Structure 1
Amino acid sequence: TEQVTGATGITQSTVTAPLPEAVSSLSLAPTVNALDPWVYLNQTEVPGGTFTVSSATQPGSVLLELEISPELNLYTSHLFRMYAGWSGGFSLKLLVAGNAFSAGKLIAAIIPPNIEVPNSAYLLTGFPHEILDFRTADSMEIIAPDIKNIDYHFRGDKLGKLVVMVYSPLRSTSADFEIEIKLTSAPLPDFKFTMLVPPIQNNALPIWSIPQAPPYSMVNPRSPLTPVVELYINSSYATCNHQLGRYTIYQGAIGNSTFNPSGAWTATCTAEAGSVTGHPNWRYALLDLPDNPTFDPTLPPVPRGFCDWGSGVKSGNKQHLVCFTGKKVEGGFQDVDTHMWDYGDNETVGLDNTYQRTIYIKDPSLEKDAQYLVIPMGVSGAANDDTVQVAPNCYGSWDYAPTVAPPLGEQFVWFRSQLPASKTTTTSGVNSVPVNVNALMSPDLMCSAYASGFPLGKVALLDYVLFGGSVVRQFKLYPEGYMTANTTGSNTGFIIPADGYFRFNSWVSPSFMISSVVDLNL
């Protein structure tokens, strides 16, 4: 069908099925559960279906990739949580923003299941497909068939994918009119469910309901016992090699990450003899691991969720970590006092800043092979926020969290925590300096995330309401744990408030660029 615009211009509401539909008989299905007709009639936006194509996007890179599955339409996905088996295709719609002054083509091809998706103008046309002009636009209705060899799917079956790619780049220099694409779908008339079953499955919940709580209520994994004073963003902090604050939906807490940071914040050491030749006698001590009684590489080499300060790579007499320390005694501990301690030993690499039992202790009179408390508390010496930020190098094979960096153009938003500075009037020899701690992610959000497991291949785009809805920033939360925001400026000290009320916006693809922009320089 075709229609003219308000005046001039021409827009086509194309409908076609690039690949024929082979409706299954559902004979093997024990019971073919029907479905509400108004669901077929109604259309919904596919998760991650909103991809924007500008004149800068390279031609050939795929912008959208959807598995033909009940997850496409919200209603069908929610029902699929009720049922067990599903069948039938989907009527996907491509809503395009056509102006008749733009110039370019997009191509939508249905990739069969178990077939790799290529990304190039060439080499992608082979698949059954359709080409949409940007000047025509308006709702190319793709009848995405249900490519099947079994009569109806069970959970986990590999599924065909619809992929949209820039067929011909946008070039019309009408002053950078980007084209936004919305994709919607709904079950085809042939779609049917089967085998009703209690509604608890592995489905990612179609909408993840964010508990309306503020960040300052959240705990700081790297700095428990310290409220999250504000959310924070820095350009310099490219990567994050932390092991205490790191959680993911799939693998759970990683490395030293724990869901009770305050609970595990404490640790103990055996205080083995010997010391390095530093001006203050730094007696060695080995952290005792309740979970690793038999020291082996596959488990962590330090107590779960112990410490992540990692002040200096070669910190000698300039930087230190300060901690309460007391000798274990009947009941509790003996005269617990603050002391300047360090990871491993400065004298040797691989131990200067790593994760191992061996650690410096300021206490000159540290008893040989006596259990000693250690509370990392804070930092002293010449440390600063960035020196704290760099976590110690973790090595071995103890499933430690790999260091990660945000996608180009985005930056890691952190849960900034203000660390009080403890200073002694008497000559205890130790004076913690004011410092701050940044946490990649807090377990509180991750709890609701685990409840509403992310849909595979999608990314939680959470918009952060700050001033009662007047100001709404947008942070992209990745399933790996880190949260990122699209930033244009280049500043290290830019701040975000801690008003709260995180809310779920929609499911977007990792490549998706946040429409909202945070000017760090501003």
Structure 2
Amino acid sequence: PIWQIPPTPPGAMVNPRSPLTPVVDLYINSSWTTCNHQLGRYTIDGGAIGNSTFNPSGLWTGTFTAESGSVSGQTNWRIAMLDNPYNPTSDPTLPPVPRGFCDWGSGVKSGARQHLVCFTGVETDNGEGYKDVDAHMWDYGDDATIGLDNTYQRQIYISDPTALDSGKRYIIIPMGASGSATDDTLQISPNCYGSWDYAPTIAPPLGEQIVWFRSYLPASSTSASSGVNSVSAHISSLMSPDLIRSAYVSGFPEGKAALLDYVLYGGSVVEQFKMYREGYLTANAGFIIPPDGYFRFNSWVSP
């Protein structure tokens, strides 16, 4: 059975790990030989494994509740707890965090060094919406204990000169990274522990690399005393749903990979890629490929 791939350029696809920013390049790096992400992982057989979705934009915004306190030492870091509608009762066999929430990495207990940014507003006391939405810095855990600093839990802390209102609900739309956060710290993701079904960490076969659908993430700061010192950066994914949702019509034959041709201009230059059934695609071998081109189904090869 042959596979028909529509001629959709990579520049017209969604970025699962960072919507609202179009794809700019295809990035291959020789220093990145693993992937422990939770968003953007798909499988031919199992569908959307891990904590991903087929509607990244719909589930990108979340809500949380203040807990009337602050972390020890730093009085500006108000503690708060994420709100999860998909798992009302805290059943250990289901993921704690809401579906589709971000997982960008920040550091092994990193404070002054770097943080992340978001939009945040209190409830309107009317049930209709929110008020006074502005930028703030946030992070997972409390950056004090090793057991829950990078643990992908439902407890976070947010910087605010004033004090949060206890028992009220706030909205979160995370967009930006602050402090000293480079590309490497964002590439890695916080660890996860428990008994729920989370996506494992893959590794490429010896002698191959991985495409990363790289994008560009700009900055958003605040001109005020102790404001938000943030910087521009880049963000990467593994696979977008648009490319892989086509294969469901005719699944991969047992123990077989696909050979793909990427055509840039006319027929002058053609690149050869290999797609596996576990989600990632490889390239034999470090540079950047332009995003204007179309994919082609060549043949089936053995892994």
Band the TM-score falls in, shorter-chain normalisation = over 0.9
TM-score, structure 2 as length reference: 0.94
Bigger shift: residues 226-235 or 358-367: 358-367
Q: Give the Cα separation in 1 of the matches to 2:250 and 2:226.
A: 50
Are residues 241 and 278 of structure 1, via their aligned partners in 2, closer, same or farther at CA, if it must alter by over 3 Å? farther
Q: State how 1:394-433 maps to structure 2 within 5 Å.
A: 394-427=192-225, 429-433=227-231
| Residue equivalent to 1:504 | 297
Measured against aligned partners, the alpha-carbon deviations of 1:256-297 in whole angstroms (never above 9, x if no partner) come to 211111111111111222222354521111111111111122
Aligned alpha-carbon RMSD (Å): 1.5
Q: Structure 1 length normalisation: TM-score?
A: 0.56
**Aligned partner (choices 102, 105, 110) of residue 315 of structure 1:** 110
Corresponding residue of 2:99: 304
What is the aligned counterpart of 1:360 among 144, 147, 157? 157
Amino acid at match of 2:107: G
What whole-Å deviation, never above 9, does each CA across 1:228-278 have from its counterpart, x for those lacking one? 111111111110000011111111112221111111111111122222235
The answer on whether the counterparts of 1:255 and 1:398 sit within 8 Å (CA) in structure 2 is no
Deviation at 1:331, TM superposition (A): 1.5
Unaligned runs of 5+ residues in structure 2 are: none
Pick 1 or 2: higher relative contact order, CA cutoff 8 A, min separation 6: 2
Residues in 1 aligned to 2:277 and 2:140: alpha-carbon distance in whole angstroms: 31
Q: Which residue of the partner structure matches residue 2 of structure 2?
A: 207
Partner of 1:472: 270
Q: Distance in 2 between matches of 1:461 and 1:239?
A: 22
Q: CA deviation at 1:427?
A: 4.2
User: Take 1:500 and 1:387, find their aligned partners in 2: how far apart are those partners?
Assistant: 31
Q: Which amino acid aligns with 1:501?
A: Y
| Candidates 32, 52, 61, aligned match of 1:257 | 52
Offset from partner CA, 1:64-118 (integer Å, 9 cap, x none): xxxxxxxxxxxxxxxxxxxxxxxxxxxxxxxxxxxxxxxxxxxxxxxxxxxxxxx
Could you list the structure 1 runs, at least 4 aligned residues long, displaced by more than 4 angstroms after superposition. Answer: none
- Alignment of 1:437 onto 2:235: yes
Aligned residue in 2 for 1:388: 186
State the match for 1:283 in structure 2: 78
Identity of aligned residues (%): 74
In the aligned structure 2, how far is the partner of 1:342 from the partner of 1:308?
11
Amino acid at match of 1:506: S
Structure 1 counterpart of 2:35: 240
Question: In the comparison of the two structures, how many residue pairs are matched?
Answer: 300
CA distance in 2: counterparts of 1:269 and 1:395, whole angstroms: 21
Deviation at 1:326, TM superposition (A): 1.2
Q: What amino acid is aligned across from residue 44 of structure 2 in structure 1?
A: I
Q: Choose the corresponding residue for 1:337, options 104, 129, 134.
A: 134
**Separation (CA, whole Å) in 1 of partners of 2:146 and 2:101:** 21
Corresponding position of 2:248: 450
Deviation at 1:434, TM superposition (A): 0.3
CA distance in 2, matches of 1:418, 1:362: 26
